[PDB]
Amino acid sequence: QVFRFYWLDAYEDQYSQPGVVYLFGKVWIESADAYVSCCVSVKNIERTVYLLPRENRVQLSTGKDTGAPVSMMHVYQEFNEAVAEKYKIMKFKSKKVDKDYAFEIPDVPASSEYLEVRYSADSPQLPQDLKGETFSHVFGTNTSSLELFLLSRKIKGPSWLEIKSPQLSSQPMSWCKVEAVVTRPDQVSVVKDLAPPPVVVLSLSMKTVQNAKTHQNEIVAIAALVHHTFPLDKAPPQPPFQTHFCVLSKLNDCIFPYDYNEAVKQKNANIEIALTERTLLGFFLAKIHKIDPDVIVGHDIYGFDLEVLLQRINSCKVPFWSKIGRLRRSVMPKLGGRSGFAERNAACGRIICDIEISAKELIRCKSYHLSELVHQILKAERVVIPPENIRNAYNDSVHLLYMLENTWIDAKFILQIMCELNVLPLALQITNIAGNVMSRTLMGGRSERNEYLLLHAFTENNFIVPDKPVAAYAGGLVLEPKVGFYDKFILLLDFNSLYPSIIQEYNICFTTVHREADEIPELPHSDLEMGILPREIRKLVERRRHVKQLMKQPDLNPDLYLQYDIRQKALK
DNA sequence: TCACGCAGTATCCTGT
RNA sequence: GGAUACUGC
């Protein structure tokens, strides 16, 4: 009955299904003695809000202070009588909680007795600035469902979760092989000290052509390399790909050179030749559904690959577009938006790895084009197929097979680059340290990681976190140099983790320094206890130090050494 | 729906 | 005065 599964990604739709979080991952099946994809739907993640009592009753901010002391009973009565009826809230459960607070909202004391209201997510949402007669502020009005789930259940990054008393599904809700429904969030718990399971990986490369009339890109070839046991905590497997599949479609005008049959017959049986782009897209979707990859990797996947894939699927009305993702949906996500959030939603439940973003984050190169990346990482030369020659290649079997093999080689290069940098294990480590979702980590950026790190740190220590938002100061000192040439030994003395060590030493934190809503605040007293930000910083620093010790091991492999270096950099 | 800070060097342009 | 780059920590 107890469902033990490893979770990799989480998807929520704030507008369609309120209070539902779709976790995806892997579960172990003895009948097949293997790992299969699973989708668990956590339901009824009730909204939680915190009301801050006033010190003296105020006549709806009209008569100002009245002098009547306020207790939690007064706040509960005010919420039950006025607010609930006004905002159409039917049923709710309220309690009292003593919580601390130190952030950028004035008049909020350090430690106060808040009233915690828990009510379903189907009801309307209270306004942020809602002020009554006994409470002066409301916190948590717009908190998301996924954030509430992760913070309440103390879930940090991919891990093993146990579910007590799972329930089946009345109708299918996902393209996975195993499904379960949790009627409460308290039924999910995290089990520590277990190894990560293998995860399938699919590296895909597309070759297209721009039809001038429509100025729209048309797909003519796709190649994919698939590994069914890619590890998340060990070195990449050699070779980096187990199986492969290639699909090639004739253009809307040109025809094969009356020898493609013999060419494919004599080459191999893994190449699928289709006549219309609709068939190509359908076969690709079916193959993706059958393989069921947890990680899909590519170059410019967010920018060009997935966007063109979805555009062509919409244009060709290819049935079952939702196969591209892991959740069965009827309306396609709107095409557009910043970065690739629309593309991410289209592939909900499947981690997407763009080697461009990871290369930008991890290493430094003059250009992040695929050719330059292959030159700098794999140390190999990649041939380039001119855009104007792909169309003309539909005149001989040899040229068409060469084009398909070029796509295959591009896919292999992408997979090799992914393996070299340890993109996946490093992403897992960073996600576990921070506590965000893996797809967010692999989409790039730094703000989300620290945001979730501090969110977890504060929630664990009984704090009320801020509400999500809806050369400004002096920096370092650069001494004036004595420019010239020096032919004698120059000794460079550098501080170790300067700013983190400053935060630790002087105890700089939200709960220590006394801010006032552009002057430098005074240093905190030395009689206090270490805050949250210092402690977290210390943890990170120690991690880095340990990695450095590993780097110091004598007689270590070069490549591994380099990997360690990268890790160090990341942590720093 | 997004996005780490600041200090510093190098190059180039200002019509209707 | 502005604009465009990318090094350093």
Ligand SMILES: Nc1nc2c(ncn2[C@H]2C[C@H](O)[C@@H](COP(=O)(O)OP(=O)(O)OP(=O)(O)O)O2)c(=O)[nH]1
């Ligand atoms: N916000 C921010 N600050 C940085 C970054 N890189 C360096 N700094 C700042 C904060 C560091 O404490 C300070 C000192 O630079 P260093 O390169 O010597 O790093 P640090 O001393 O922290 O560690 P290390 O000497 O490499 O062991 O410069 C950065 O990428 N972002």
Ligand SMILES: [Mg+2]
């Ligand atoms: Mg330093």
Ligand SMILES: [Mg+2]
């Ligand atoms: Mg000036």
